[PDB]
Amino acid sequence: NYTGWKAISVGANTSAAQTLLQMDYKDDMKVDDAIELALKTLSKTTDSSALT
Amino acid sequence: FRNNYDGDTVTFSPTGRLFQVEYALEAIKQGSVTVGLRSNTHAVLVALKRNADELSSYQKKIIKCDEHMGLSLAGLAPDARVLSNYLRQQCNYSSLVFNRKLAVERAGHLLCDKAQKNTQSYGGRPYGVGLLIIGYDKSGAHLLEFQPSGNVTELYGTAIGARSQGAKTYLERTLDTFIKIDGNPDELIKAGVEAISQSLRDESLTVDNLSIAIVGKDTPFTIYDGEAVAKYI
Amino acid sequence: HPLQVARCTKIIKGEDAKYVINLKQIAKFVVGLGERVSPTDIEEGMRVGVDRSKYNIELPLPPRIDPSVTMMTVEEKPDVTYSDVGGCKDQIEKLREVVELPLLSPERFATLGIDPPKGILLYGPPGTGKTLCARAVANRTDATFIRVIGSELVQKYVGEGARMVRELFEMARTKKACIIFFDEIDAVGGARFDDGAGGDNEVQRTMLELITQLDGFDPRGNIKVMFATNRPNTLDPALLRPGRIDRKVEFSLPDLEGRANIFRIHSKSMSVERGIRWELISRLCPNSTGAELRSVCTEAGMFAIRARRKVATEKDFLKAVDKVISGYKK
Amino acid sequence: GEITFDGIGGLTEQIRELREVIELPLKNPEIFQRVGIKPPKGVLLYGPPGTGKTLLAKAVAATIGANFIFSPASGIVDKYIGESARIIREMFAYAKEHEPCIIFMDEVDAIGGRRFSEGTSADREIQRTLMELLTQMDGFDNLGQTKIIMATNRPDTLDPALLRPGRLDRKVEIPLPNEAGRLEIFKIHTAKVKKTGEFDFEAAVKMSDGFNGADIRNCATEAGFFAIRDDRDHINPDDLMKAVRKVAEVKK
Amino acid sequence: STRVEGSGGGDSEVQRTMLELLNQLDGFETSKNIKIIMATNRLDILDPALLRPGRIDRKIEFPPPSVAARAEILRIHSRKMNLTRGINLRKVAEKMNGCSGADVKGVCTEAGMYALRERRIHVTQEDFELAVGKVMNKNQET
Amino acid sequence: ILYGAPGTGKTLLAKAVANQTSATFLRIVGSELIQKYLGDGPRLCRQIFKVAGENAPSIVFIDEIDAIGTKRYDSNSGGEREIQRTMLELLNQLDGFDDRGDVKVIMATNKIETLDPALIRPGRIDRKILFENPDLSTKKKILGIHTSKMNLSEDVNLETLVTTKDDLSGADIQAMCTEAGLLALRERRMQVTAEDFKQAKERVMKNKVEENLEGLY
Amino acid sequence: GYDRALSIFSPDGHIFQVEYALEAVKRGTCAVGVKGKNCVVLGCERRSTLKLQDTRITPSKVSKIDSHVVLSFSGLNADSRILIEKARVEAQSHRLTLEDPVTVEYLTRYVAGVQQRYTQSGGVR
Amino acid sequence: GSRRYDSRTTIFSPEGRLYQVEYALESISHAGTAIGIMASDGIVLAAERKV
Amino acid sequence: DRGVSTFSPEGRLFQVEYSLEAIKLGSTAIGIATKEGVVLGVEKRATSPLLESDSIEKIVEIDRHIGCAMSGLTADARSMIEHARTAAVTHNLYYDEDINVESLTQSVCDLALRFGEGASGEERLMSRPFGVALLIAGHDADDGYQLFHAEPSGTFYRYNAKAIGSGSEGAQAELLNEWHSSLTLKEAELLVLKILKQVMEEKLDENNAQLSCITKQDGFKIYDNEKTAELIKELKEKEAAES
Amino acid sequence: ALMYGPPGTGKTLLARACAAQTNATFLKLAAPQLVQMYIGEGAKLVRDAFALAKEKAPTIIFIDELDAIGTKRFDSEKSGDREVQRTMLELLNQLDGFSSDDRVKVLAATNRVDVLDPALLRSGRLDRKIEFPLPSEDSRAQILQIHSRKMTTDDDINWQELARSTDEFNGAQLKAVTVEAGMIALRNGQSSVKHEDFVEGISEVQARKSKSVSFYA
């Protein structure tokens, strides 16, 4: 089964990442605005001192 | 236990019989009775045609396979059909190729191999059918008993199908009379209708849906049906 | 005079003059070694007697006459002769050969050399047609039917149990030409691992008493004993062995023709149209015990009131089948 | 013991090394105290039962004049609080009172063993029993004039705690005897049975390979069926040959 | 903290018994402000009917701890402790990952044990980091 | 027979009906008789039937007959003989009692293939009543009663609440009301918005629906 | 192996695989067709609460088999694609050999045969 | 025999999807993350490296 | 579950018996053979008021003088129906003449056994045999009108009447008394429907029955619905005037 | 002594027959009654038998079945099946204690023996191995000749025929057959049994004779 999406996550922690994505999503984002967004989401699903 | 030697064609017993052979022997009995007797110049099959429904119409269950060969069945009818199918093909290939007319023993041996290949894979199976094959070749008259167990003996007399033991005991007694009577049909046919009536004990005998089949020196393969069995009841 | 334990609270003398039977695990009083010759007496205290189990002491004053040592239901020449007995043909034929014909002609079985089955064991769905079938053969020969409830034989007192079994077999010998029908035989118990599990002592007393009485001195030519079981695999080895159980009969389910007849029998009470056919209901009905057929019949009437008519059409019978058979889920 | 320790002879190696581990600390606790080493703790018999296994256990006890005490391990399985504790302790207490004594514990896979995986299915009853054995041995309590002897069909089946020294220091194996070994055992066995001068020890020994004490005993009794048959009151070469061949045939 | 991993029949049989009482109280008595606290984190072998209103009327989820929270729990407990000045507690907390409230109590008692071993009443930040790493290993076992 | 879960299905209907008929409701817990000594289940069954005949009209509610309700296939090899005995005493009294309106029996149980086909006894137990999750209309009624008792906003509707429901039990709806009022009382106020009931509903549904399966594909 | 007993009758006469198939249908989306007598309307549900997708990257409910033949389904996505591919090969082969734009019934006969096929005979589920 | 050493699990569950397939999904949810973001001037992909 | 080589005590595989049970749960099909015609009736069955008539197959043509009625599953009979058309077409190509009723039947039933990974000069590859029995009627110049009952177990019986269904009990017993050597084609159709209405629990109508017959007058003719209704209406009068 | 081979050949009758003749006490112990789910119980039962055996002497301790308690394993999984293992072991331990004696006899029967040990080949234990192989045709005619001795006959029976037609039939099976042969004779009107009655008993099902006209028209 396949679907198309505007933001999705697969593998571990699908629920957490998807929830955040739906909220900050826009359609006037640029590459650099997305990267920033992406990098926030990844942070909030990983628990660390730092991510390298 | 059951599941060790049932469906499993690759197994053995210290005794050498599996469950699949004993069921096959029982299946022969659940067909109708058919008796065999022969001299040395003729071979006869007397077989009872008894319908298994009220509305059902009588149809031949002795099948002529060649000019000098046929069989009657007792047991499972699909199982009987495939073998008859292979044997008619086999009959042709010998006649075209080697001009060879089969003796019963030769066919038999072929028959054992066929069953044997299907008892060496789970996807094939053993059968559930005995056959009495008559034929007249140049070694005289013959009657053979074929078994799914691959035991083939050529006999003077036998019976297979239900209630074999009536007929066997009569057949072993009138043995000595019948084998020395050569060139005379009518006595051996009549004696076959008497034999089969000792197999029956509680099941009808039909005076126009008995079917007798004969082969011999002076008889090419004829099945007497309807009227023409009358003068041998 | 019921007593199943008899204190007399330190009436004291002595040789002797206490003469008190207590049968209770705590305190074992044996007055053994054969005779004490007495006119009436052990000792005093409203309670001269020798409990339910006797430590010698050959029976002064009535201690083991106790008001209910019977409570089972006897029906001589039963009401049932055909009730739920349609399509039970294989079962019914067996009962004819086993029971009916030696009762009808005792002389023929004697001359032959054979014994008709001493005991029969009946398994399969129980009382759905089973008890009925048994009552049907019995009525035909005019043979007393004795129906004993396994569960009652479970009294919580000493021997109380050995008391009941004994009198049941005594009754069988008096009224002989008769069938003792035991529904349950796992109520009074068969094989188990729970004899070491510290209670079922009362049970064990009953079981052994039963075996002894039957094989021992019950004639088994006309008197038939029929056993019924819920697990066929839980028999005790004494029970199993030939000389006590011979015939093992299957319950046979009503067949298509049979269910239609039972449908006619039960609707005679109901107030329904007689122009319909029973046959019709049966084709939609799959393999059902006598109990289920009866359940169709009470349900077609509830349907009939629901559909707002005081007769049941074919159509209520069809609905009534659909409802009970799905509901049943066995 | 039922028999002495030199009348079962042809198990002689196993006799020899049971004798110096078990008998000597019981008789002479003083030598082990004086050196300053521990008296021995536990001894293990392993191999099939009746290879002369039972003989060796009965026989070490006779010579000491110990009491041999056979304990059924399952019975050590009461389903009540501390009953299980109670029983082990009492044997140990009695072993010291009635000293010297052999406490012989048969099968250590109804109160010990390695189980299914040592989880909980009713494998805690078994775990409680083993724990008790291990705590007394390792602890302040000890074995001195209580000797404990474990018996097991095959030794690999036993917990590795039991396989440590300080539970079982001595671990004896019971193999199939030598031809020399068979020879010594047969001469003893056939001696106590009355027989004719024309009996041939030499012939039977030659026919016998892989025979335990039990197998020699069978050859005497089998011959004896033929000897009632041949109408005698004593065992003869004719009875002996037949008997020896039959016992051979039935087994490898 | 009182774990026992539910039960299918040893503490499901007992809850049935409990469940009659709670039913009887909602009836004629009509008694409330009489409380039962259950807590469990599995219910794939515990009965749902307990969680139905009548018995348990509110079902509240425990929050997961965070780095910001672990720092607070540590801040309260260390207050009794004698510390070496210049210490930074947010740093020690951040070095925690996953740690629940009991684990935070372990960090102070181990930090102190390390100090004790060296015969110090004051504990540096460094001992506290080493203590947290030990505590993380404890949660990984079984 | 009432099938489903109690407190929401089996318990409610059985309490309700007794009150309507003005009969004595007797709840016995089946399992608890599940006593661990041979012989005492059968006494206990006797006392149930004894009280009934003395004190009719009555509804006999036997809760959860699946510990004493067993009937096995054995009594050897880990087979326990008491359990089966008790099941049989229970059955024989039940079949001994028959009425037109002195006793109606309500059972609770969630497997019928642990029970004897003579404890069903076809021609006694005709009826098989089972709980489901309610319809839109009946859900409308369950909501309607519960909001009567609230003080609430008028932005809340029964209609709005129905559409986001996927069919739930009445117990979830009750639970939703208690959870919702608790967020309103926490905000210190007695008005319960459409948003409050919606937060509460989502949350319990989530805690119950621990297993999940994609059904749309 | 896998050329046998995927599919056989019970003695109750249910087929395992067919019985678990009908269950995937009840679970999935909803499709309905109502006929006029000079029109046919096909209405479809596509059900998603998650709003982070478009219709133009989520497959359509009505797929064209031909310009004048349409197909609707309910069930697994994966399986339906297999069936759709056969129906397009059968439209164009028919047009080729009989030289008639397609009859809709014949196309049903082809999709239905495949469906019969993997049930009756093993080596496919 | 060996015709009964077949796992028979690539047949349907009653749950509307094959045993092995549903179980396999779990396996995915226990391995690395991939995240896909589609933007209006790119597509951004991030994945966290397992070990 | 169950092996393709695992028999019952009687020689008969599990799987074979099990097909035969599902047959009996289908729809009722009744055929009566005389020497004036063979009449075939079936219940077509409407599964809903919105199921269209004559889109469900119960009367099929194998050839223009040869029919079959089915009972069991309808898709399972399709593999058989295909094989039966093919056999008919081929024999006519080769020999420019008609297939005999028997011959036709044998050809389908040889390939209804099969199953398993077996072979012996027969290719067997099925997972199951077919779940369907069919009553195969034809007329051939030699033997005239005949009726044959095909079991998918590779078994075949010659018949002069047979009924199958869940309505089999009433219909075979009725058929024995009703049977005669010749009787008119119009009396026969009317009489078939009479038997059908009896074993049917509901009102018999033409929106759940289709009739058919085979003639030497004009070959296989499906006796259609409009014409059949007018006979059902007569049925109501004749039947409530014996009552 | 040890007995092996299929039961119902008359093993149980021989055990009793030997007991009656020597003037020994038959003590029948069924091996699955000893197998308790409770601790140590069977072991105690095994010991109680031997002890009473010595007071009651001479005695044959007849243990019907030794296949239920024969299981003793060789693995480490013995824990679970301790109970069966202990009973088997218990009997060998006690037996071996003496050997000048034979005023208790132990007789065991096994469906077929499966293990062998030095334990199970020692004198004073189970030395003796007597095998019961399925009986012959000649043997069946004599066992049959016994059953019909009680019967009244017309002296028209022929034993030979019937005996060759049966196939590895046992003593029990043959007895039942004589009773069926008499019932048939009752049905025919006869009050005596001839050969045909027996032949007809063979015809009814025994997994090698059957009657029908199926798969044949």
PDB file of C-alpha atoms in Angstrom, chain C residues 185-324:
ATOM      1  CA  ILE C 185     -20.878 -41.636  36.957  1.00  0.00           C
ATOM      2  CA  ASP C 186     -18.226 -38.840  37.315  1.00  0.00           C
ATOM      3  CA  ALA C 187     -20.489 -37.224  39.993  1.00  0.00           C
ATOM      4  CA  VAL C 188     -19.697 -40.357  42.045  1.00  0.00           C
ATOM      5  CA  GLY C 189     -16.280 -40.324  40.383  1.00  0.00           C
ATOM      6  CA  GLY C 190     -14.013 -42.490  38.133  1.00  0.00           C
ATOM      7  CA  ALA C 191     -10.222 -42.088  37.745  1.00  0.00           C
ATOM      8  CA  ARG C 192      -8.406 -39.146  39.210  1.00  0.00           C
ATOM      9  CA  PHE C 193      -5.100 -37.787  40.604  1.00  0.00           C
ATOM     10  CA  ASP C 194      -7.020 -35.989  43.354  1.00  0.00           C
ATOM     11  CA  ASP C 195      -7.298 -38.778  45.878  1.00  0.00           C
ATOM     12  CA  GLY C 196      -3.964 -37.564  47.319  1.00  0.00           C
ATOM     13  CA  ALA C 197      -5.259 -34.016  47.204  1.00  0.00           C
ATOM     14  CA  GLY C 198      -7.032 -34.568  50.534  1.00  0.00           C
ATOM     15  CA  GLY C 199     -10.883 -34.562  50.504  1.00  0.00           C
ATOM     16  CA  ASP C 200     -12.379 -37.053  48.148  1.00  0.00           C
ATOM     17  CA  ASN C 201     -12.561 -39.901  50.746  1.00  0.00           C
ATOM     18  CA  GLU C 202     -16.333 -39.714  50.827  1.00  0.00           C
ATOM     19  CA  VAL C 203     -16.278 -40.184  47.023  1.00  0.00           C
ATOM     20  CA  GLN C 204     -13.976 -43.208  47.203  1.00  0.00           C
ATOM     21  CA  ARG C 205     -16.234 -45.015  49.657  1.00  0.00           C
ATOM     22  CA  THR C 206     -19.125 -44.695  47.209  1.00  0.00           C
ATOM     23  CA  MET C 207     -17.190 -45.851  44.224  1.00  0.00           C
ATOM     24  CA  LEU C 208     -15.897 -49.015  45.704  1.00  0.00           C
ATOM     25  CA  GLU C 209     -19.206 -49.958  47.237  1.00  0.00           C
ATOM     26  CA  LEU C 210     -20.876 -49.672  43.833  1.00  0.00           C
ATOM     27  CA  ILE C 211     -18.446 -51.995  42.024  1.00  0.00           C
ATOM     28  CA  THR C 212     -18.784 -54.693  44.676  1.00  0.00           C
ATOM     29  CA  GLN C 213     -22.519 -54.838  44.600  1.00  0.00           C
ATOM     30  CA  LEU C 214     -22.858 -55.085  40.876  1.00  0.00           C
ATOM     31  CA  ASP C 215     -20.313 -57.651  39.828  1.00  0.00           C
ATOM     32  CA  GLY C 216     -20.837 -59.539  43.116  1.00  0.00           C
ATOM     33  CA  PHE C 217     -24.379 -60.936  43.228  1.00  0.00           C
ATOM     34  CA  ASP C 218     -26.523 -58.844  40.951  1.00  0.00           C
ATOM     35  CA  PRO C 219     -27.983 -61.178  38.259  1.00  0.00           C
ATOM     36  CA  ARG C 220     -27.438 -59.503  34.918  1.00  0.00           C
ATOM     37  CA  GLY C 221     -29.728 -61.403  32.580  1.00  0.00           C
ATOM     38  CA  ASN C 222     -32.892 -59.317  32.844  1.00  0.00           C
ATOM     39  CA  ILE C 223     -31.645 -56.668  35.177  1.00  0.00           C
ATOM     40  CA  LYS C 224     -29.779 -54.267  33.020  1.00  0.00           C
ATOM     41  CA  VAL C 225     -27.567 -51.517  34.260  1.00  0.00           C
ATOM     42  CA  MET C 226     -26.958 -48.513  31.953  1.00  0.00           C
ATOM     43  CA  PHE C 227     -24.146 -46.056  32.659  1.00  0.00           C
ATOM     44  CA  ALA C 228     -23.800 -42.589  31.258  1.00  0.00           C
ATOM     45  CA  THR C 229     -20.662 -40.639  31.143  1.00  0.00           C
ATOM     46  CA  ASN C 230     -19.577 -37.052  30.247  1.00  0.00           C
ATOM     47  CA  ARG C 231     -15.901 -37.777  29.580  1.00  0.00           C
ATOM     48  CA  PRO C 232     -15.441 -41.311  28.082  1.00  0.00           C
ATOM     49  CA  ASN C 233     -11.849 -41.357  29.017  1.00  0.00           C
ATOM     50  CA  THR C 234     -12.158 -40.863  32.816  1.00  0.00           C
ATOM     51  CA  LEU C 235     -13.237 -44.411  33.761  1.00  0.00           C
ATOM     52  CA  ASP C 236     -11.623 -46.090  36.687  1.00  0.00           C
ATOM     53  CA  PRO C 237      -9.960 -49.425  35.738  1.00  0.00           C
ATOM     54  CA  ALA C 238     -12.404 -51.464  37.743  1.00  0.00           C
ATOM     55  CA  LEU C 239     -15.225 -49.872  35.776  1.00  0.00           C
ATOM     56  CA  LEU C 240     -13.765 -50.446  32.308  1.00  0.00           C
ATOM     57  CA  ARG C 241     -13.092 -54.171  32.186  1.00  0.00           C
ATOM     58  CA  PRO C 242     -15.250 -56.756  30.409  1.00  0.00           C
ATOM     59  CA  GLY C 243     -17.674 -58.522  32.714  1.00  0.00           C
ATOM     60  CA  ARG C 244     -19.165 -55.276  33.819  1.00  0.00           C
ATOM     61  CA  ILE C 245     -19.318 -53.123  30.634  1.00  0.00           C
ATOM     62  CA  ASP C 246     -19.629 -54.752  27.298  1.00  0.00           C
ATOM     63  CA  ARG C 247     -21.689 -52.691  24.973  1.00  0.00           C
ATOM     64  CA  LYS C 248     -20.605 -49.111  24.217  1.00  0.00           C
ATOM     65  CA  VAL C 249     -23.495 -47.218  22.423  1.00  0.00           C
ATOM     66  CA  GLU C 250     -23.209 -43.910  20.479  1.00  0.00           C
ATOM     67  CA  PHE C 251     -25.906 -41.136  20.689  1.00  0.00           C
ATOM     68  CA  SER C 252     -27.507 -40.822  17.304  1.00  0.00           C
ATOM     69  CA  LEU C 253     -28.644 -37.425  16.058  1.00  0.00           C
ATOM     70  CA  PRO C 254     -32.191 -37.048  14.506  1.00  0.00           C
ATOM     71  CA  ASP C 255     -31.978 -37.283  10.714  1.00  0.00           C
ATOM     72  CA  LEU C 256     -33.805 -35.246   8.179  1.00  0.00           C
ATOM     73  CA  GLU C 257     -36.867 -37.394   8.123  1.00  0.00           C
ATOM     74  CA  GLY C 258     -36.758 -37.710  11.899  1.00  0.00           C
ATOM     75  CA  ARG C 259     -36.641 -34.055  12.722  1.00  0.00           C
ATOM     76  CA  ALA C 260     -39.872 -33.463  10.632  1.00  0.00           C
ATOM     77  CA  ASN C 261     -41.755 -36.082  12.648  1.00  0.00           C
ATOM     78  CA  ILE C 262     -40.542 -34.636  16.018  1.00  0.00           C
ATOM     79  CA  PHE C 263     -41.700 -31.173  14.658  1.00  0.00           C
ATOM     80  CA  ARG C 264     -45.323 -32.598  14.286  1.00  0.00           C
ATOM     81  CA  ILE C 265     -45.329 -34.281  17.689  1.00  0.00           C
ATOM     82  CA  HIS C 266     -44.444 -31.026  19.683  1.00  0.00           C
ATOM     83  CA  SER C 267     -46.723 -28.655  17.715  1.00  0.00           C
ATOM     84  CA  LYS C 268     -49.836 -30.632  18.756  1.00  0.00           C
ATOM     85  CA  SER C 269     -49.791 -28.547  21.970  1.00  0.00           C
ATOM     86  CA  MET C 270     -49.147 -25.324  20.104  1.00  0.00           C
ATOM     87  CA  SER C 271     -52.046 -23.570  18.296  1.00  0.00           C
ATOM     88  CA  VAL C 272     -50.623 -23.475  14.585  1.00  0.00           C
ATOM     89  CA  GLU C 273     -51.768 -23.907  10.948  1.00  0.00           C
ATOM     90  CA  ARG C 274     -51.828 -27.656   9.846  1.00  0.00           C
ATOM     91  CA  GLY C 275     -51.786 -26.862   6.168  1.00  0.00           C
ATOM     92  CA  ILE C 276     -47.994 -26.025   6.209  1.00  0.00           C
ATOM     93  CA  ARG C 277     -45.401 -28.950   6.115  1.00  0.00           C
ATOM     94  CA  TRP C 278     -42.791 -29.824   8.797  1.00  0.00           C
ATOM     95  CA  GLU C 279     -40.398 -31.032   6.104  1.00  0.00           C
ATOM     96  CA  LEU C 280     -39.800 -27.486   4.997  1.00  0.00           C
ATOM     97  CA  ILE C 281     -38.518 -26.366   8.315  1.00  0.00           C
ATOM     98  CA  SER C 282     -36.116 -29.430   8.400  1.00  0.00           C
ATOM     99  CA  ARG C 283     -34.243 -28.579   5.104  1.00  0.00           C
ATOM    100  CA  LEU C 284     -33.088 -25.282   6.588  1.00  0.00           C
ATOM    101  CA  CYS C 285     -32.324 -27.015   9.890  1.00  0.00           C
ATOM    102  CA  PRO C 286     -28.841 -28.549  10.106  1.00  0.00           C
ATOM    103  CA  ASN C 287     -27.850 -31.531  12.490  1.00  0.00           C
ATOM    104  CA  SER C 288     -29.637 -30.834  15.812  1.00  0.00           C
ATOM    105  CA  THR C 289     -30.282 -32.850  18.936  1.00  0.00           C
ATOM    106  CA  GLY C 290     -33.876 -33.541  20.250  1.00  0.00           C
ATOM    107  CA  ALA C 291     -33.412 -30.530  22.635  1.00  0.00           C
ATOM    108  CA  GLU C 292     -32.928 -28.038  19.765  1.00  0.00           C
ATOM    109  CA  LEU C 293     -36.128 -29.206  18.052  1.00  0.00           C
ATOM    110  CA  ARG C 294     -38.115 -28.404  21.089  1.00  0.00           C
ATOM    111  CA  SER C 295     -36.377 -24.976  21.358  1.00  0.00           C
ATOM    112  CA  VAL C 296     -37.545 -24.255  17.716  1.00  0.00           C
ATOM    113  CA  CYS C 297     -41.130 -24.977  18.729  1.00  0.00           C
ATOM    114  CA  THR C 298     -41.285 -22.633  21.787  1.00  0.00           C
ATOM    115  CA  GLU C 299     -39.480 -19.889  19.750  1.00  0.00           C
ATOM    116  CA  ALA C 300     -41.979 -20.028  16.684  1.00  0.00           C
ATOM    117  CA  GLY C 301     -44.774 -19.111  19.089  1.00  0.00           C
ATOM    118  CA  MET C 302     -42.816 -16.073  20.518  1.00  0.00           C
ATOM    119  CA  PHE C 303     -42.238 -15.025  16.912  1.00  0.00           C
ATOM    120  CA  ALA C 304     -45.860 -15.581  16.121  1.00  0.00           C
ATOM    121  CA  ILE C 305     -47.023 -13.030  18.885  1.00  0.00           C
ATOM    122  CA  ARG C 306     -44.317 -10.648  17.587  1.00  0.00           C
ATOM    123  CA  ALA C 307     -45.539 -10.819  14.037  1.00  0.00           C
ATOM    124  CA  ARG C 308     -49.063 -10.117  15.256  1.00  0.00           C
ATOM    125  CA  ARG C 309     -51.008 -13.210  14.647  1.00  0.00           C
ATOM    126  CA  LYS C 310     -52.415 -15.889  16.906  1.00  0.00           C
ATOM    127  CA  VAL C 311     -51.396 -18.826  14.504  1.00  0.00           C
ATOM    128  CA  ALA C 312     -47.829 -19.639  13.533  1.00  0.00           C
ATOM    129  CA  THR C 313     -47.213 -19.525   9.743  1.00  0.00           C
ATOM    130  CA  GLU C 314     -44.241 -21.372   8.066  1.00  0.00           C
ATOM    131  CA  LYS C 315     -42.383 -18.190   8.215  1.00  0.00           C
ATOM    132  CA  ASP C 316     -42.248 -18.032  12.145  1.00  0.00           C
ATOM    133  CA  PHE C 317     -40.787 -21.642  12.062  1.00  0.00           C
ATOM    134  CA  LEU C 318     -38.153 -20.527   9.589  1.00  0.00           C
ATOM    135  CA  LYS C 319     -37.197 -17.504  11.808  1.00  0.00           C
ATOM    136  CA  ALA C 320     -37.151 -19.602  14.889  1.00  0.00           C
ATOM    137  CA  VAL C 321     -34.629 -21.967  13.385  1.00  0.00           C
ATOM    138  CA  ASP C 322     -32.395 -19.078  12.297  1.00  0.00           C
ATOM    139  CA  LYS C 323     -32.376 -17.644  15.858  1.00  0.00           C
ATOM    140  CA  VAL C 324     -31.830 -20.771  18.020  1.00  0.00           C
TER     141      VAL C 324
END
